[PDB]
Amino acid sequence: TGLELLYLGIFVAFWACMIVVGICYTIFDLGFRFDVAWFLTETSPFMWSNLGIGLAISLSVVGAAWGIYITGSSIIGGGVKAPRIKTKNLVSIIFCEAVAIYGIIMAIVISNMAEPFSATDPKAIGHRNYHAGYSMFGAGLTVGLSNLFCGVCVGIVGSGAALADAQNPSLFVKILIVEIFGSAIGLFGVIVAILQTSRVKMG
Amino acid sequence: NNPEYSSFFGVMGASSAMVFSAMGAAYGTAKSGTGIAAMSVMRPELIMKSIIPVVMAGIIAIYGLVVAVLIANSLTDGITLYRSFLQLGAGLSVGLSGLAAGFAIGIVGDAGVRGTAQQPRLFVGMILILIFAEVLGLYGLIVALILSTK
Amino acid sequence: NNPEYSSFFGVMGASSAMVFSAMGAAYGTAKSGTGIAAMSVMRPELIMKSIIPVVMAGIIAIYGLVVAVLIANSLTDGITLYRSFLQLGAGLSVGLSGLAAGFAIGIVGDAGVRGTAQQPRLFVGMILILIFAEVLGLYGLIVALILSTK
Amino acid sequence: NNPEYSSFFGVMGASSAMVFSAMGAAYGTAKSGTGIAAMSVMRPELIMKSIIPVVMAGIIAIYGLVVAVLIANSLTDGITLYRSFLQLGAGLSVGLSGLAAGFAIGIVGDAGVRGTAQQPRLFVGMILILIFAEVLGLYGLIVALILSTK
Amino acid sequence: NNPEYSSFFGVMGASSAMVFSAMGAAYGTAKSGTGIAAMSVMRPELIMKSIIPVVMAGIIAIYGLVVAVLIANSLTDGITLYRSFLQLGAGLSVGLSGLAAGFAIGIVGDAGVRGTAQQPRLFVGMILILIFAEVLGLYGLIVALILSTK
Amino acid sequence: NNPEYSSFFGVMGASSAMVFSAMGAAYGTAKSGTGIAAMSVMRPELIMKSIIPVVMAGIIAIYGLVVAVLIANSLTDGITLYRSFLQLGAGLSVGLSGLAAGFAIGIVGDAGVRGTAQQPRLFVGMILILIFAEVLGLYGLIVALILSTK
Amino acid sequence: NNPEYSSFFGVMGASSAMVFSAMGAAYGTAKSGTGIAAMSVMRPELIMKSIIPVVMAGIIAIYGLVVAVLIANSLTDGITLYRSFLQLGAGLSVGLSGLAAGFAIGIVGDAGVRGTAQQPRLFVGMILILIFAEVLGLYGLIVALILSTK
Amino acid sequence: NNPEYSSFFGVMGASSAMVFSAMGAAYGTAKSGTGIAAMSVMRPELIMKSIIPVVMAGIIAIYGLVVAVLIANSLTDGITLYRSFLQLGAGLSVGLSGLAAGFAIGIVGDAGVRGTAQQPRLFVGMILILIFAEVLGLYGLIVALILSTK
Amino acid sequence: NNPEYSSFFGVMGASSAMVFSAMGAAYGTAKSGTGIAAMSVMRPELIMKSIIPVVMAGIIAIYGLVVAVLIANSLTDGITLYRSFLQLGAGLSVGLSGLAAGFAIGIVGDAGVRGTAQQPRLFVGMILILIFAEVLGLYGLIVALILSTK
Amino acid sequence: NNPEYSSFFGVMGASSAMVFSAMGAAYGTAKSGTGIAAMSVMRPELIMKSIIPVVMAGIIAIYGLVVAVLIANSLTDGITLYRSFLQLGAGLSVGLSGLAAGFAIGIVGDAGVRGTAQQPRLFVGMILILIFAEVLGLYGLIVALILSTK
Amino acid sequence: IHPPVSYNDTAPRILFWAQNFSVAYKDEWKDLTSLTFGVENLNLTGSFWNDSFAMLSLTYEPLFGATVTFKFILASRFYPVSARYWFTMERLEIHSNGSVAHFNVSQVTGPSIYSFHCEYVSSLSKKGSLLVTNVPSLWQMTLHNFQIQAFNVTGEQFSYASDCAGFFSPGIWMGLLTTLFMLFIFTYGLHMILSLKTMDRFDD
Amino acid sequence: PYNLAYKYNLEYSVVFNLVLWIMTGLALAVIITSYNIWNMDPGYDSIIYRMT
């Protein structure tokens, strides 16, 4: 378990550093130095917005592809002895890809929210503008991960569906209900992202 | 007026609600779904009965969505830092709660579907266990509603 | 002259109280549920006598909800730093106590219900051990309410 | 006068005392319970007497609780950082010492019951080792009480 | 006027656009070629038909290249922080998308090539599935272009 | 004069002295207990005579307690930062020395008691290795004492 | 005007352009070489014709060399941060692209050679897959060169 | 000058000097004892002479003690930062060196005693190897001594 | 005048230069040695021919030494940060590249030697692959030399 | 004047010079000794010659001692930061180089003695390989001496 | 080490120090350290103090064909985010022959009960440019090892000092976020690529 | 005198981050290389079962 032990080690080291540094700053009275406000304010809103969009598309694509191959491996393997599978169980693939479709829709929608500032001072940038940054970042994060999880879910259930179909033709049309419910989660993510961006304006 | 950076935590509250709820619902759905798929070939007469756990996972997802919508509507560019923290609290409360609930629904659904495949009488007990598992997310939803509305 | 950032800790107390107790309850339901599903294939008559651990995990969850809701009610927009830290302490106390107690409840229920399946005399030992576990969540609740109300 | 964040470490102590000792007690409870449920199959007559390990483990939780509530009633809004540090020390002492104790009780009891299933004489040695395990939690209580009182 | 470090984010965007796409392509080709060899030893006559998945991996690599060079074209000295982050967004968008698409194309390709080796009827299925993965890379590329040309 | 947080390192020294010694003693008792339980099956006449390793683990705990108590007794409020550091040093010394000793006693005993069960001759050897492992905790105590006095 | 520490990112461009392409070539030659050794014991007359994958890994290395040498030539003292970042970007683009490419080369070469030993006709297909991976390193070079000259 | 935090490094030096040497001795004793227990069942007559590697671990412990006592003797409130740093250096020098020596002695003994049980002649060669393994700690001690008295 | 801390990066270049080169060489020698030992038990006639990969690793060692000597000689107490950074770049470029070459040399040496015992014809190809492995370290040395002299 | 904390890096240089060389020598000693035991059991007569690798590991220990002592004798309070960083570089350069050399010597010693038991004539190649491994530590020393005396 | 400049009101109330203090007009530099610190003839006329506000008016008679003066204008106030009174140096006001010039100040801030320190508080780009203007100006100023405290003073001593020297800067933080979200992706990719494997056997 | 603050440099942020992250990368590289060699397979499989 080499690389996982590495990730665990770096994680433990990072959070040990966080804990100790927190205790030391509090004990030394450096709450004025440690003010999260400065971090959140001087990190430019553009960075938030654009990480937001990039994740919005990319995490959605990750979910789509992950689920895609999870179910495709099964679809192929079962199809080996069950050629009927290839046309029918492809609905698993299509429902996986719908996640990346959502990814684009929200990514481009958010991209329509961005505009320059011509301001550097936080006071000049303003509440509206900083809110635009954080809101775009959050909406992107939300859509991206909801899509990711919907995708992995749909892929897994679709793999199960293809394997089940391999043994009986009739079951697939019924198991697909679980696939529909899986897609519903991604749709919820899309809705939440829409609401989050609905009242956002850079400029 | 309230500080410029305040709205960040409210944004995160909405996002956390939806995202962690989605994680929970996705796991529950996928686990119950693999269980259902494996069971179907054996005892095809039980599919439409065995679905229910996926509906419970969807219920967790709905729990997430409700809170997320509430925070989204409550959110504005000039919220007080206090209300922003409270929105984040509501979001995390429903979200992580839904995640735990989702792991519960997934594992219980898988095991119970597998059992009922072998022994029908387990069904009602499985429903009861599923209810108690979703009840976990329900508690998170209650606390989140209170935090948000306060 | 109450810092606005101070109120965050009370929100986090409420969150923790909900979420960690929720995770404990989820694991407790999960392991007991897999145990129950395994047992039910061979000894179905034990379903209702064996669901008790799930109920006890539910009690862990209700403990979490009680503490979280109380913390939420106590919260205010200008809450003092002292009281807010008290609420964080209550939240962590109850939440992690519930996490641990739920871990115990789940493992005990799994192993036990399986034990009863082969040996029904064990049922009394199960219920004793399960309550001894739930008592840990009780202690978490005690401490949590004391801090949250001071 | 005194720094306002002083109370944070006091509440941290109050929490730690209960939470860590509770984790130890939970682990001990779990391991001993699995051992009990295992041994019951072959020698069902021994379960009640053999529960003594879970009975002993709950004591670590009692210890955690007492130190927790003592830190609690010692807390107030204006404590000096010195006192807050003593409270943190007491909490960590009892909690983590109880965690070590709980690992000890869990392992020793789990092994001991299974052994006793094959050799009833072991019971006495099991009790002896279990006492030597609880005393670790007890020492943590001693140091925690001294610190918190100072 | 503009901060002196502004170009770093655009550069990172370009580098990511190249690199993540390249890694995805590499994984895809490696997996696919492995499957191609495995099928080959038994079925020499399918090499030319079977190579396709490696070709789609090449497509994702090309997607990375086009996006990367497009960003490089926009990497100007007086780049405003706004444009720089737009280019970083383009970078990540194409890059992670391509990495995922490479995973998908590679795994699907291996599975499909092995299946075809035994069942010629599956080849059309292979291609049909693979296109649905490659369109993901198309999607990432599209959004990256929109961002870079905002 | 002294910065008001100087006692932090003193309380940390106390916590270390107790807790790490407790961890070492717990590990020692745990592994010794596994050894005793395992050997009990075929050699029950060795139980009462084989408890020695657990006793030595108890002595580990005793050093922990002694150093922690000395530390706490000597903690005055305006403690010079110098002695506070020295005191963290004493606590760490005894505590981690006790942890090392705990590893030593536990690993020694878990194998030594089994070896004795097969071979009575080993008992003297095992006690010799145990005392040599015990002097490790003893050295930790010496060093901690000199730093506490100093 | 030219922050003093600017030289760092150009230097890292150089270092990466070398080291990451080198690691890629190293893995490629390594895995391919294990494959060559394995095949040798069966099919000696293929040995000389089989080395192409190691050659292409060496081409990954030469790509690294071209980019790194150009970067070093461009490393002037008073470099602007703009050019230093472009210089780093070129470095990473070549280096990591080559790392991925070399991974691909290694796996594919191993698979291809051992297959070829079993079935000669695989040779052309293997060459094609190697080419389609190598173009990845070529793109790494192209993007790195563009970034560096711009 | 002499900042008030100076003595911390020297104190940590003493702690390390004892603690790391103690851990090394602990592991050495543990492995050597496990090997001794394994050997005794077969050849009980070797115990008196075979114990020696544990004594070598004890020598490492003694090295740790000597450096620790020297450091402690040297400490002082008005210690100059340079003396504190030398003290820390000596502490690490002895401690980690002893840890390495402990690893070496432990592994060597575990292997060598087992081998000797199966072959009488190995004894002396084993002793030579242990001598070299301890020589490492002796170098550690010398370096720590020079640093401390510098 | 230049910032005093610049010296750090030059010394780091020296250290990295020698260290990574040495580690790569060590890996190469070690695995090649395992191969040689496994080979010899069969074919002692191939010892002198089989030693070659170890020499090839020693070549990496020599490369590291060369760059490190250059870095150390060039260091000065008033080194500009530009030159210090440049020295760091040279060190990384040779050292890590040599580490990659070290893994390559070692793995190929092991596999090739083992095969060669089974099939002497492999030897020529094993030389060619060894050379291709080393030219990686040669490229590292070239880049590092250019950097160190600029 | 140079800041007071400057001598940190010199003291670390000495300590590391001892410590990492120690770790490398310890590992080499360890593996060599395991191999020596294994070979000796079957072929006791070969011990006296087979010990040599442990001696060559002791050589790494010697390198570490030499460089550490040199640095210690060079340390001074008014040490220039540049000289201090030079000493740190030397310490790392000897130490981690010795780590690499100890790794190589350990693996080679293990494998080579294990083979030598079966084929004595491997001794020549073994000795040559250990020479090639020790020259790594020699290079580390040469770099360290240059850096430190500079 | 020369003593700080102090304005007193029944006790020292505003305190200022630097190792080097210099100014230029039409790019002709001149040094003010000796004429500023320790010397009693430093006219502070017009200087003013309030618990909310402070204005330190240093003065030099012959400089640049003018009786020049430098007003450092500082204030303190309650920020609801935290209970503390923060302080800031709002602007620097040069007073010259029949003329005035205004420099905004960027990063001189901190808790009012702590002093503030910075290397090279100066208008020149190469040295941080903490003093800034929209209008291009004839004036340059440089303060090497600038340190100041205008509130909660207690005797000649400075309070403990906050410093410009944060462990991070805006640019560095944004860069670290960017590189971290690149590294996440890279580690994912490298993990999967390293989990790649090859088969040991082939069919008939 | 006069409680003058310690003279933190202006480029403290950049120098500190460079040191921290370069040393982190160096330490991780060293640790991983050591890990890989520590687990290097000694590869005497032809001998292991005769020895054991």
From Swiss-Prot, chains B, C, D, E, F, G, H, I, J:
Transport recorded as keyword: yes
Lumenal side: 72-87, 148-150
SUPFAM superfamilies (alphabetical): F1F0 ATP synthase subunit C
Subcellular location as annotated: Cytoplasmic vesicle, Clathrin-coated vesicle membrane; Cytoplasmic vesicle, Secretory vesicle, Synaptic vesicle membrane
GO CC term (a single one): membrane
Chief place of localization: membrane
InterPro entries per the UniProt record, alphabetical: ATPase_proteolipid_c-like_dom, ATPase_proteolipid_csu, ATPase_proteolipid_su_C_euk, F/V-ATP_Csub_sf
Swiss-Prot/TrEMBL GO biological process terms: negative regulation of autophagic cell death; positive regulation of ERK1 and ERK2 cascade; positive regulation of Wnt signaling pathway; synaptic vesicle lumen acidification
Tissue expression as described in the entry: Expressed in brain (at protein level).
PTM comment text: Ubiquitinated by RNF182, leading to its degradation via the ubiquitin-proteasome pathway.
UniProt key word Membrane: yes
Residues annotated as site: Essential for proton translocation: 134
Gene Ontology molecular function: proton-transporting ATPase activity, rotational mechanism; ubiquitin protein ligase binding
Keyword vocabulary terms for this entry: Cytoplasmic vesicle, Hydrogen ion transport, Ion transport, Membrane, Synapse, Transmembrane, Transmembrane helix, Transport, Ubl conjugation
Membrane topology category: Multi-pass membrane protein
Pfam family for this entry, one: ATP-synt_C
Residues exposed to the Cytoplasmic side: 29-50, 110-126
Function statement: Proton-conducting pore forming subunit of the V0 complex of vacuolar(H+)-ATPase (V-ATPase), a multisubunit enzyme composed of a peripheral complex (V1) that hydrolyzes ATP and a membrane integral complex (V0) that translocates protons. V-ATPase is responsible for acidifying and maintaining the pH of intracellular compartments and in some cell types, is targeted to the plasma membrane, where it is responsible for acidifying the extracellular environment.
Family: Belongs to the V-ATPase proteolipid subunit family.
Protein name: V-type proton ATPase 16 kDa proteolipid subunit c
Source organism: Rattus norvegicus
Gene: Atp6v0c
Swiss-Prot record, chain K:
Tissues expressing the protein: Expressed in brain (at protein level).
Residue numbers on the Cytoplasmic membrane side: 187-204
Family in the record: Belongs to the vacuolar ATPase subunit S1 family.
Source organism of the structure: Rattus norvegicus
Glycosylation sites: 8, 20, 43, 50, 97, 104, 152
Complexes and interactors: Accessory component of the multisubunit proton-transporting vacuolar (V)-ATPase protein pump. Interacts (via N-terminus) with ATP6AP2 (via N-terminus). Interacts with RNASEK. Interacts with TMEM106B (via C-terminus).
Listed GO CC annotations: clathrin-coated vesicle membrane; endoplasmic reticulum membrane; endoplasmic reticulum-Golgi intermediate compartment membrane; endosome membrane; membrane; proton-transporting V-type ATPase complex; synaptic vesicle membrane
Places the protein is found: Endoplasmic reticulum membrane; Endoplasmic reticulum-Golgi intermediate compartment membrane; Cytoplasmic vesicle, Secretory vesicle, Synaptic vesicle membrane; Cytoplasmic vesicle, Clathrin-coated vesicle membrane
GO biological process, one term: osteoclast development
UniProtKB keywords: Cytoplasmic vesicle, Endoplasmic reticulum, Glycoprotein, Hydrogen ion transport, Ion transport, Membrane, Signal, Synapse, Transmembrane, Transmembrane helix, Transport
Single Gene Ontology MF annotation: small GTPase binding
Parts of the chain that traverse the membrane: 166-186
Domain of life, per lineage: Eukaryota
Chief location of this protein within or outside the cell: endoplasmic reticulum
Posttranslational mods: N-glycosylated.
Name recorded for this polypeptide: V-type proton ATPase subunit S1
Protein purpose: Accessory subunit of the proton-transporting vacuolar (V)-ATPase protein pump, which is required for luminal acidification of secretory vesicles. Guides the V-type ATPase into specialized subcellular compartments, such as neuroendocrine regulated secretory vesicles or the ruffled border of the osteoclast, thereby regulating its activity. Involved in membrane trafficking and Ca(2+)-dependent membrane fusion. May play a role in the assembly of the V-type ATPase complex.
UniProtKB/Swiss-Prot annotation, chain L:
Protein name from the UniProt record: Renin receptor cytoplasmic fragment
Gene behind the chain: Atp6ap2
Residue ranges that the UniProt entry lists as topological domain Cytoplasmic: 33-52
Coiled-coil region: none
Portion of the parent chain present: 292 to 343 of 350
Regions crossing the membrane: 12-32
Organism (species): Rattus norvegicus
